[PDB]
Structure formats: structure tokens, C-alpha cells
Amino acid sequence: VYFTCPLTGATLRKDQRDACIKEAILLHFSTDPVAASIMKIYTFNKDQDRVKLGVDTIAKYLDNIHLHPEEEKYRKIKLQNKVFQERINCLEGTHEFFEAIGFQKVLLPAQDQEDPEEFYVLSETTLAQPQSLERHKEQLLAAEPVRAKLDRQRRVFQPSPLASQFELPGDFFNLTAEEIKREQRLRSEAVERLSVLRTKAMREKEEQRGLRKYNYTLLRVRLPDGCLLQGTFYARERLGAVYGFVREALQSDWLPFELLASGGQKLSEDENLALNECGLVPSALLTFSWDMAVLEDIKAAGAEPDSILKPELLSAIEKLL
Amino acid sequence: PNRLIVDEAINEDNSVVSLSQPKMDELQLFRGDTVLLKGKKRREAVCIVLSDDTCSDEKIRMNRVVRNNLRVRLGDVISIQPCPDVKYGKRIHVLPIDDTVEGITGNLFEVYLKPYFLEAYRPIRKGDIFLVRGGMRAVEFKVVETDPSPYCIVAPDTVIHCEGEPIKREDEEESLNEVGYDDIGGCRKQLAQIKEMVELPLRHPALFKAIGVKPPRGILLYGPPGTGKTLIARAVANETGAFFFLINGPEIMSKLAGESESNLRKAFEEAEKNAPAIIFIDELDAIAPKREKTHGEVERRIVSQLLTLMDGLKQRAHVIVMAATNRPNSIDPALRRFGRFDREVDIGIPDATGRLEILQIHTKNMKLADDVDLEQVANETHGHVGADLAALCSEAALQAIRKKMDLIDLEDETIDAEVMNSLAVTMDDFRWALSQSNPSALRETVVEVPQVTWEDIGGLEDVKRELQELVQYPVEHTPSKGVLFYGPPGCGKTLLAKAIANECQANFISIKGPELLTMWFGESEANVREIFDKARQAAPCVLFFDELDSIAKARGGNIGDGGGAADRVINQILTEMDGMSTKKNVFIIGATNRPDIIDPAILRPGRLDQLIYIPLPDEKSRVAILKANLRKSPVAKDVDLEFLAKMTNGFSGADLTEICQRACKLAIRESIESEIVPEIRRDHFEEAMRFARRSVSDNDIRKYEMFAQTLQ
Ligand SMILES: Nc1ncnc2c1ncn2[C@@H]1O[C@H](COP(=O)(O)OP(=O)(O)O)[C@@H](O)[C@H]1O
Ligand SMILES: Nc1ncnc2c1ncn2[C@@H]1O[C@H](COP(=O)(O)OP(=O)(O)O)[C@@H](O)[C@H]1O
């Protein structure tokens, strides 16, 4: 599976995504330290619920000094505060953001302890113009994690009759002693497994072994004109993205159609159902058919629907072997 | 390479096969792609491939219709060759097989072929035979012409043609209405045992022909009538291809001396000539009754003749003899000696799940109404066997037929397919049939997995864990194979034994006081062995002996007769327990409410070594008990279950249930009176609290505490 990194334009694999994006964000600090730290807070941290709480707590500290910019009590953000330690200090990139928007990290005496405590203290240069922090607050809160865009890799193929031309060896159906012993051992083990008295937890340990293999899917569509349309999707992608993909591939993107799944269930374009929920993962073939309403007018007018896909894709058609 | 062993289907559809995903990834084909399957005699079939979580990595799952088209059988190997070039068809000519179109007429396309293919996009090849079910008939068709060749996908714009006389079946074609494995519902474990013993020598005869090792010579199938003893024997023969010879007691016993023995040995000679073959002798107790139970010469001779013919199986290669009986002890013991019929399978009585599957099998061709609930039927048909569920479905069909035929008024030799197509069997027709059906296996003990789960038991968090450890330890890592429960009554002793069986999916065998007393009073304590023998056959199972002190009480309890703590029945139980190993997958649980009068032998090492005290529930447990009891009913928000639990300090779990049931009864009465309120209100619990009382006094609790401290 291939992706494009939005910060570099590079073509990456599924395992190379974080390495390239993280590097681009760390380099971006030379152009815009605030924008780079904002991308770092959302992108590096996998726990987005904590990121949302972290940036909301940071936004409150900035608004506190905005309300009372003349009072020194709101100029210093204590790094040991219970709310800071749980929401902000637990995230990567939050300290870089504070420094980027004019906060200096200093040690100040505590109001009740000898040991100095850590504070982020806003400088006079930025405090004089609250409009700077107000813009930086909105830039952080409106941000999203950076992720490489999935390349659909739209392709059309032409099946070749030669793909199914195969003759079996004369001894193909002559099974060996090793094949017979494995089958008879599986029969004896199956009867023994049915006889075993075990708890549900022991049953789950064995059954659960089949649950973790896939997170992407490849879909194919069989078209009336003999062409095969293929593309790449996330396993969690919604069925509406598959209809949009096919519409872009069709010669006429506006002409109503249906996509029938391999299990006999028709896919609804307006239904927010994931590919890994409807049984189209890790791969599946869909059957393409035009809506009956347009087929009646097309056939009644004497027009043969001999072209399904746009010439822009067909000019690059590959044969299957 | 690119070849898999043929296995049974899970999806009954005739156009699809299922592979394990790793092989679809190696073959680079997707779910829904069309592939060709290469079988024997240079034949092929076209189908759609899917995947599931159960297919073996090295096997392909396909149903009987697909296997017959390839002329292959379970255990064979076929090649998979994807064919993405398959195109949509323009015209396909399909004609029915004459063997299935008798008594039926009219337009078969509109009833069978049209809805079968319409928007189904099934791959079709010239020469394919496929089955369409409906109208209480199973009609199969053969494809005789395809405009594209040699195969295509049927589309909504494909012309489906059907003109001409029905096709006469070819001599190498088998009927799709023959008995196979897909016609057997419950008792899947027993069928698997038969497969292990029988399919190997029949599918792979060379394994035993080239060497001196012999396969099993015979299998005795026993259990109540109508459970599938003959159904299994026929299904195995038809699926493996072995010639099936049918013998039964009455057929041989009705003959005169000489003719009887001649017919019996002649069938054996025919089986050898037609080997591989299976000889099924039904009513074994009738053809070979116990010698000591007969005076006639013919009966003594026929037993000796069968014993010699069974021994001759050392020379009659690839012939296996199976027999059916009601009980292993109804036949002459000579047949059960080493060899002959030294292996037996307990078919038993289908449980609630098996009964549902059996009903679904008999409705394969039946059109059901939307209100039909076969699971509800299966739950009510307690004590029924497959033979009775077959009658149940047929009676429901006949009631539906009468209701419509009275208005149809069609008097002819055949029925138009459209007339049967519109006929459906509704829940009123199954309900009627249920009232007319009478179970044939109501007296025999019914053993199945209990429906009581851990969510139904309030409190006892530590006892739940202890039971899970006792069963899980011998599987994850001499371990104890049983536990005795003691303490006040009504705290969950029975529920604990059932709940552990439930979670393990183990069979639960419930022996109650009256059964132990029946054996004692009738001087039939030997029947204890049969109980333990059922536990072995039912394994995995939990063998629960309730009221272990029922006889000690019957003999006096607080006063006493001339004996001690031991009696005839417990002595047989103690003896039988010594013969059960920890590897038999049987967990023995006992319960008593009077440990001071139980034979101490039961707690000696090797038997009920674990001992669990079940006290009265505490406050947090009593709340859990009330909530569990009310999980099946609507309860108003004004009901304070914690307040009730605080008051019911001396109540057992059974006593808290009385409160819940009283409140339910009151809510029902009020609803009925108003109709002639929809939820249980605090007023119903406050009234119930006025009558419910603790069943266990403080003195009785002290009795249990003193016992616990006596044993430590
Ligand atoms: N376990 C079962 N599963 C499915 N059908 C069953 C089962 N047991 C019995 N039947 C049905 O009951 C009938 C059995 O009658 P028969 O062939 O005489 O066998 P038997 O008397 O040995 O049970 C058949 O119609 C069969 O379909
Ligand atoms: N721990 C418990 N949790 C919930 N209900 C209980 C409990 N103990 C007893 N009961 C109630 O008492 C009834 C009888 O329980 P049972 O286990 O049959 O008692 P015993 O084992 O003494 O015969 C059950 O229907 C159940 O509703």
C-alpha cells in the first residue's frame, strides 16, 4: 500500500509514514516554529483525546493573561500544576509550542516551598500585543494530526482467456501416505477437542488466534463492457468513498448505478458503513450495473452501452495473466 | 500446488465455495471472483469463491451440488484455476430433470429458475446440474445450451429459456435428494466419531490392503428410536460411495429355517463382491436376541450365523458392518466381544440447538411465513427426536395445505407450480401440529448443556473463580475431579453446578433425590453404573448428584434405622467413582443440606476432595440476587432493591426470589384486572415483603458453621 506525504510530496509505504512526516515537522521549525510545534502536538501523539484536552488547557492559560494582561499572577504557567501535568506535560511537542509563542521556561521560588518550581513566563514583547497569542491559540485549536494520504492507485485491467488455460498432471488425483496421515490425525484431534472439558477462557485463547491479520483492502469491480476496475481503500473506509471512486472512473460520473457485493447484498451509497463491517476486507469483487431507469431509456433509444469507463483510464489498461 | 482437499460446506448456496484466506492470498483472487474447479474425468465447474473463519488452510469447502458436478467426494483433491475472463451470458437453455418433475406442472421458470437466477449473478457452465428448492418440492435442472461457451455469468438481461421434455437422468448422475451429511442435524460429535472410524478404510482402501492391519469390523449405534441411527449409516455410505446393504431383524426372522440364515449370509457375500460396502443390520436385538431369552432353534442358529459372518470380515476386505439397537444390553453379549461390534456410539436425544437444526433440515423445501419461529418451537419440543420433528413439520405442512386446497379446488394428477409457490406454513400451523405431536423419547433422560450462566447467580464471586480453576487447571497445566457443596439451602448449590457446565459448553446430568431413592427402594442400585456410563458418553459433562443424603434421611435422618451412613446406592456410587479417570472430561459435583449424615467415604481422597461452603448471601450479594431475578421483567424506577436487600438480612437467594415472583404475580393480576401497571411498581414489592420469610433459621446456620470448623 502506497501513501503521499502532504509535507514533502514523497511516495511512502504503510510503515514509512510516521518517519517521513515526523522529520518534515521537525525540519519545519526553521520556517515557522509555531506551525511546526502545532503539527508536532497533534501528529506525534497517538492519543488524540489527550491532545484535545492538552490544547484546550493551553488555550485557557493564554485567555487568562488576555483577561488580566496587567497582572503578574497570570503571566506564569506552573509546569507542576495538576491540570498541566495530566493534559499538557504528558504530550510531545507542547513545550516547543510555548517557547515558539513567546513563553520562557524559568525557575521561580514557590509561594510555600524553598525548592524553585518550573514556569512558562510570557515576555513583554508578546504581552504588549495580545493579538499574537490570540492568533496562535486559534492555529493550535483548529489543527489536525498529519497523516499520509492513501493513493487509490486507480487501474483498469483486461482479463485474458489464457489465464484459465491449465491441464492437470495425470497423477494429480493420486494422494500420498503423508496426506492420508495428516487428514486422519486431524479427524482424531477433532474428536478429542469435542471431548475436552474446558472453560470459556481456554476456548477464547485458541479462537482469538484468527483475529489480527488485516487493516487495508483492495476492491475490484466487474463492468458490463468486460473491463475490471481496481483501487485501494482503508479497511475502515466508508462505502460512499467506493461509489465516489467508481463515479470518477466511469465515462459519465452523473449516471446512477448500483454496486452489488460478493455476498448478494447491495451497497447503499448514502449509508455510513465501513468496508470491514460489510465483508469487503481484505479484498472483494463488486458487480456493476446501471440503474434500471436509465437502462430503459438507453435501450429504448437504440443506444448500446458498450463503454463503461472514461477513455482517460482505458488508454492505460493492463492485461491480466 | 494450487490444490486443496474437498471438505463440507458451511454456506449451503450452490454457486459458492469457501477458502481459507491465506490460500486466496496465494492464488491472488478476491472474495467474489469467479474460478474454475478441476475434478475427476476431466470435468470442471465454475463458482464464486468466498472465505470464512472455519475452513482449514489446506481444504476447500463445497456442498453436495458442487461435488456431484465435479464427480468428487469428501476427502478428494481438486485444482483451483481463476477465470476472470468469464463474461455475462446472453441466452441459457435450462431443462428440469424428469426424476424431480413428477406430480408437478405449470410454469417452472416463474417459480424456480427466475427467482433463483434473478440478480444472483451465478456462474453457469454447460452441463451443470443445480437444485432449486421451493413449493415443498426439490427440483433440479440441467443446463443444455449456453450462447457463450463453455461458461458465463447470468445477468438480469440474460435470456432464460426452457422448452422441451424433461431430461432423463444419466446413469452416472446421482439424485440430489439422496441422503447425505447435510441431512443430519444434531449429534454432530457422534457423526464425527463415525467419520474417523469408517471413512478412512473406504476412501483410502490401499492403507489397509497393502498391510496386515485391519480397520474396525463393526460399529453399534444405540439410542432411542428416531434419533438418526439409520440416517448416519446411509449418509456415510452415500457420501463415500460404498455400496449400502440394508438388513433388519424382521426381514430375516419372518423367513423359515434355512431361508433365514441363507439370506443373511448371501447379503454378506454380495457386500464383498460390491466392496467397498457397508452392511447395516437394523433391530440387532431382533435378528440376534440374547440366547438366554429364546427357546427356538432358529434364533440360536441365526446368532451363531451372524457371529461367524462377522468373523469372516478378516477376508471380506473393505466391508464394514454397522448395526442399530435401543441399548447396548439388549443384544447377545457375544456380538460385543473383541472385534465384531466392540465399538459403539451413543446417539442420545437432540438438545435444543440440535432440534432447531433438525427442523431447519425438514423445512429445506418449505415456504415459511414471516411469523414462524423455529427456535421457539425447538425450545418447546422437549423429549422429541428427529423422527418426531419430521412428523411435526409434515403435520404443519398438511394443515397449511388443507387450509388453501379447500379454496383452490384443483382436482388433477399434478399441481401447478404457482399453486405450491403461494402456499406457506405459518406459526398457527406449527402450533396446531405441536398439540397433535407426541414425543417418542419422553421417558428417556434428556442430557444437554444447561442454560444457567454466571450472570444468573448473585454473589459468590470467589466460588465462581474456584470452579473455573478446578476445571481450567487440568487443561492449562492427580487433580481433583469433584467437589461437594454444603451449607444452607436456597443459596445456589445447583446453579453453581449448572453455570460451570454452561460456560464450558458441557453437558449437565442432573440426578435428584427421588432418583437415588428410587434405586434404593427398588433394590436396583446397579443402575448407578448406567449413570456414570452416561457421564462418559456425554463427556465433556458435569455429573451432579443432588441430595446425597436423601437415603440417609429416608432411613431416619434424625432418628435412624439399623444401618449407618452408607447404603446400597451410595456404595455403588463410591465404587463407580473409583473407576473414572481425570482424563474422562467428567467433573462430578455433589450437594447436601445435612453433611452430618452423609457417608464420609464420599470425601475420601480421589473422590469429592474439594469442599465449598455456600453461606447466606451478604448485603451486596442480596442486591445482586434481586437484580438478577428481575433481569427478565420491567421494573419501575421507584423500586429500591437496595432497601429491600438491607431488610432481608436473613433471607436466602431462594427467599429473595419468592419476593420477586410475588411482585411479578401482583403486577400481572393488576394488568389483567385493568384490561378487563405495565411494570412492577414499589407497591408490588412492598406487598410481597409482607409475606416472604427466611427459610433458614439462625440455629441451622450455626449447625453448618460448626461442621465447617470441625473439618477445617
Ligand atoms: N439426528 C437427526 N437429524 C436429522 N434428521 C433426523 C435425525 N434423527 C432422525 N431424523 C429423521 O427421522 C427419520 C429417521 O427415520 P429412519 O430412516 O427410520 O431412521 P431411524 O429410525 O434409525 O432414526 C428421517 O426422516 C430423518 O430425517
Ligand atoms: N445465589 C443466588 N443468586 C440468584 N438466585 C438464587 C441464588 N440462590 C438461590 N437462588 C434462587 O433460588 C432458586 C433455587 O435455587 P437452587 O440452586 O435450585 O437451590 P438448591 O440448590 O438449594 O435446590 C433459583 O430459582 C434462584 O432463583
Numbering used by the authors:
A (entry chain G): 121 to 441
B (entry chain F): 23 to 499, 509 to 707, 728 to 763
What did the paper state?
p97, also known as valosin-containing protein, is an essential cytosolic AAA+ (ATPases associated with diverse cellular activities) hexamer that unfolds substrate polypeptides to support protein homeostasis and macromolecular disassembly. p97 forms homohexamers that enclose a central channel through which substrates are translocated and unfolded; each protomer consists of two AAA+ ATPase domains (D1 and D2), an N-terminal domain (NTD) and an unstructured C-terminal tail. UBXD1 contains three conserved p97 interaction motifs: a VCP-interacting motif (VIM) helix and ubiquitin regulatory X (UBX) domain, which canonically interact with the NTD, and a PUB domain (peptide:N-glycanase and UBA-containing or UBX-containing proteins) that interacts with the C-terminal tail. Here we identify UBXD1 as a potent p97 ATPase inhibitor and report structures of intact human p97–UBXD1 complexes that reveal extensive UBXD1 contacts across p97 and an asymmetric remodeling of the hexamer.
In p97–UBXD1open, a single UBXD1 is similarly bound but the interface between P1 and P6 is separated by ~8 Å relative to p97–UBXD1closed, creating an open-ring arrangement of the p97 hexamer. The open state features a modest right-handed spiral with an overall elevation change of 7 Å, largely owing to a 9° downward rotation of P1. In addition to movements between protomers, there is a notable rotation between the small and large subdomains of D2 in protomer P1 in both states. This rotation is particularly evident in the open state, in which the small subdomain is rotated upward by 10° relative to p97ADP. In the open state, the D1 and D2 domains are separated by 8 Å and 11 Å, respectively. These changes remodel the nucleotide-binding pockets of P1 by displacing the arginine fingers from P6, probably precluding ATP hydrolysis in P1. However, the p97 open ring is observed only in the singly bound UBXD1 configuration, indicating that this conformation is driven by binding of one UBXD1. Strikingly, the remaining 25% are in the open state with a singly bound UBXD1, indicating that under substoichiometric conditions, UBXD1 binds predominantly as one per hexamer in the ring-open conformation. These data further support the functional significance of the open conformation, wherein binding by one UBXD1 through multiple interactions breaks the p97 interprotomer interface and opens the hexamer ring. An open state was not present in the dataset, indicating that this conformation may require a post-hydrolysis ADP state of p97.
